Design an enzyme around this catalytic site. Structure first.
Site, short mmCIF file in Angstrom:
data_model
loop_
_atom_site.label_atom_id
_atom_site.label_comp_id
_atom_site.label_asym_id
_atom_site.label_seq_id
_atom_site.Cartn_x
_atom_site.Cartn_y
_atom_site.Cartn_z
N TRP A 1 13.40 26.02 50.83
CA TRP A 1 14.00 24.71 50.54
C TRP A 1 15.04 24.80 49.44
O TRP A 1 16.02 24.04 49.45
CB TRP A 1 12.90 23.68 50.25
CG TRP A 1 12.07 23.43 51.47
CD1 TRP A 1 10.76 23.77 51.68
CD2 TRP A 1 12.54 22.87 52.71
NE1 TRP A 1 10.39 23.44 52.96
CE2 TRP A 1 11.46 22.89 53.61
CE3 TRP A 1 13.77 22.34 53.13
CZ2 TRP A 1 11.57 22.38 54.92
CZ3 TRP A 1 13.87 21.84 54.43
CH2 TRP A 1 12.77 21.86 55.30
N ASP B 1 13.55 19.42 43.12
CA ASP B 1 13.03 18.96 44.41
C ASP B 1 11.50 18.99 44.38
O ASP B 1 10.89 20.06 44.40
CB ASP B 1 13.60 19.87 45.50
CG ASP B 1 13.15 19.48 46.90
OD1 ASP B 1 12.31 18.59 47.09
OD2 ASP B 1 13.67 20.12 47.84
N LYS C 1 6.30 14.08 53.20
CA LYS C 1 5.58 15.13 52.48
C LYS C 1 4.57 14.44 51.55
O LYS C 1 3.80 13.60 52.03
CB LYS C 1 6.55 16.03 51.73
CG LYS C 1 7.52 16.78 52.66
CD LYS C 1 6.77 17.79 53.49
CE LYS C 1 7.71 18.53 54.42
NZ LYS C 1 8.56 19.47 53.68
C1 PLP Z 1 9.94 19.15 53.76
C2 PLP Z 1 10.81 19.47 52.65
C3 PLP Z 1 12.17 19.12 52.67
C4 PLP Z 1 12.79 18.55 53.92
O1 PLP Z 1 14.13 18.13 53.73
P1 PLP Z 1 14.55 16.75 54.54
O2 PLP Z 1 16.06 16.67 54.46
O3 PLP Z 1 13.76 15.59 53.95
O4 PLP Z 1 14.07 17.06 55.98
C5 PLP Z 1 12.92 19.36 51.54
N1 PLP Z 1 12.45 19.91 50.41
C6 PLP Z 1 11.16 20.29 50.39
C7 PLP Z 1 10.63 20.94 49.14
C8 PLP Z 1 10.32 20.07 51.49
O5 PLP Z 1 9.00 20.36 51.39
#
Ligand code: PLP
Ligand code: CA
Ligand code: CL
Lengths: 355, 358
Positions: free
Chosen positions: A100, A170, A194
């Site tokens: 991510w 994040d 989440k």
């Molecule tokens: C699931 C997740 C995402 C997903 O990004 P979206 O644009 O909301 O689909 C982003 N960052 C993290 C840490 C995640 O666990």
């Protein structure tokens, strides 16, 4: 019971889903659906105000932070963050500890000079890169971290010092999983489905001084300063998020989830570490996530048998992410301790029968 | 009661009943839509039906792409110049009301906006003749607003823009009648108006426009990537995609866009008939060829009588008839979900109101 260990969407509290269904045609006895409420009407304005007030109380968010509820997920905010909080091509530091963070880097490269201050990619994201080796930029617009890497099971347990440069994190998969010292951050954000906001609800918590930055030329709809002055989820989604916040408060808040999530994760890691090598987790102990726990059986055939037998036993969605393989047990706030207990009991029985 | 709101629009009662009934038990499966993974086979099948049903509803050809998007029409008004124009390229806009002004606002940072035609200087009452439009040979596109909800102004044709693609905001009129999609480069619609409050926007893109480079931009702002990932470039709003799909199914089960053309023509004819026969007691100044079928504003002889009309109508079960704050007056919105009986009830109230007050 049927325990849902999905990494996304997170299992939602049963009582919350039941309430949303029950009053979908008759909110608070009013006779109308939340779905058809005007965002600007008095009824929905109270729902939105309670959602913000409840989130502020849950996380102890001071008045000198703004709170936004937004569409477009975490990835949209990963593009908007450099456009709002950096000068064009200003350096921004990113710490990459998993998938991510790589995604956050991918969105931002067009807009800022993205510096990889540290990365654990060369070891396959099995640890956090040691803070001592981070290469931070004096003039960075921000330092971006991913608090909990959901695919790789790698989690920060300390707020890193970044000098006078704002920290942006994040928290999609761990927000409100334990106390969060909001004042240590410039920006905290979380996508939907989440740990916190359900379908269609992303959350951003923004230190207000950062809204005084020029950022980069951008349309008004891409300007957080305009959002704060007056791209919000549909009303029913926002209402559902508000129900989740109220549930979290009713359960005892982040004090309770800290204890519950620590206990769930200790049970699962204990089951892994005591299994004589039949179950294996490869993440450095200091970085082991409480929220998403990847582990491996001796081969992929046993991995598949485990997922299928677990599913038959009422333990759902345990297949690991494709880029990792194996098993992944996600243990979000709405997963009760009993679900970790049920997984650990299944793990013991499965090993007795196949190990 | 009848809800004449311009937004959010009246949802069909059957759609809400179905959504409530299967919220925790989709198709008898015991699973909730709100907890389905968008890449799981169940929701993949929902998304495939939603696209198929929309393609059937509007007769969308195979050489157009269909996207389901978060962020509303305003987000797409920023993304359109970022995807379909080079940086600073000329883009032509036709302003027939406030949603056109909003589209211009989002685009102006990214393209050289030229107002090819506007009615703003006369309170949006009347557009210039087509021959007086200032269209640019080098424009990336011509943007129009198919239906303007505040002033009740609608294109009842498709303007000829030569070889420059036409991009049209259909938020308040999409699927209200047959549409020859091939006459457009891009058709798009936010939620809350003729789609109802479904919480997702739709875009219909002529696939050759995706061969353009647009402007340097994040992948999440790149329709090419959204098309390559079938509107699942990141986490989509699943529940909302499902609700939009129920609305498409309801529209097909009512007889599709030929049936809504008939119903909407009949509702509008009733209301404009009541206005036009009133001896000036109900005033609408929009030229007949531009009169919206979907949002019908009108004015009583003074603002005090406007307020009496809103209040007495509310007491008669006719809701949300107050005009937009910027214009005042009355506004009857007549979206697909509004039955003919709602327009009949409004016209009967209009006749009694004039008999009493006139
Ligand atoms: C699931 C997740 C995402 C997903 O990004 P979206 O644009 O909301 O689909 C982003 N960052 C993290 C840490 C995640 O666990
Ligand atoms: Ca760069
Ligand atoms: Cl909506």
């Amino acid at each position: 019971r049927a325990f849902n260990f999905s990494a996304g969407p997170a299992t939602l509290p049963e009582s919350v889903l039941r309430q949303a269904q029950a009053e979908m045609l008759d909110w608070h006895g009013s006779g109308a659906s939340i779905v058809e409420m005007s965002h600007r009407g008095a009824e929905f304005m109270s729902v939105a105000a309670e959602a913000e007030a409840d989130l502020r109380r849950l996380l102890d968010i001071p008045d000198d932070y703004a709170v936004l509820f937004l569409s477009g997920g975490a990835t949209t905010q990963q593009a908007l963050i450099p456009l709002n909080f950096a000068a064009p091509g200003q350096r921004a530091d990113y710490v990459v500890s998993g998938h991510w963070g790589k995604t956050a880097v991918k969105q931002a490269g067009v807009y800022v000079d993205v510096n990889i201050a540290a990365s654990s990619e060369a070891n396959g994201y099995r640890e956090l890169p040691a803070r001592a080796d981070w290469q931070l930029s004096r003039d960075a617009a921000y330092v971006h971290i991913t608090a909990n890497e959901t695919i790789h099971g790698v989690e920060f347990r300390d707020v890193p010092d970044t000098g006078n440069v704002p920290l942006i994190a994040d928290f999609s998969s761990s927000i409100a999983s334990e106390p969060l010292d909001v004042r240590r951050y410039g920006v905290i954000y979380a996508g939907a489905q989440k740990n916190l906001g359900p379908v269609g609800v992303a959350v951003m918590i923004i230190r207000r001084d950062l809204l005084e930055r020029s950022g980069q030329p951008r349309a008004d709809i891409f300007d957080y300063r305009s959002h704060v002055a007056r791209n919000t989820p549909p009303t029913w989604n926002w209402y559902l998020a508000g129900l989740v916040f109220k549930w979290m408060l009713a359960e005892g808040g982040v004090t309770e989830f800290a204890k519950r999530n620590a206990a769930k994760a200790a049970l699962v890691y204990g089951a892994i570490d005591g299994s004589g090598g039949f179950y294996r987790n490869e993440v450095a102990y200091a970085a082991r996530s409480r929220m998403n726990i990847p582990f491996f059986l001796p081969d992929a055939e046993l991995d598949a048998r485990f997922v299928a037998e677990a599913k038959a036993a009422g333990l759902l969605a345990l297949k690991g992410h494709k880029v990792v393989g194996g098993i992944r047990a996600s243990l979000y706030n709405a997963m009760p301790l009993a679900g970790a207990e049920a997984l650990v009991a299944f793990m013991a029985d499965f090993q007795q029968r196949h190990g």
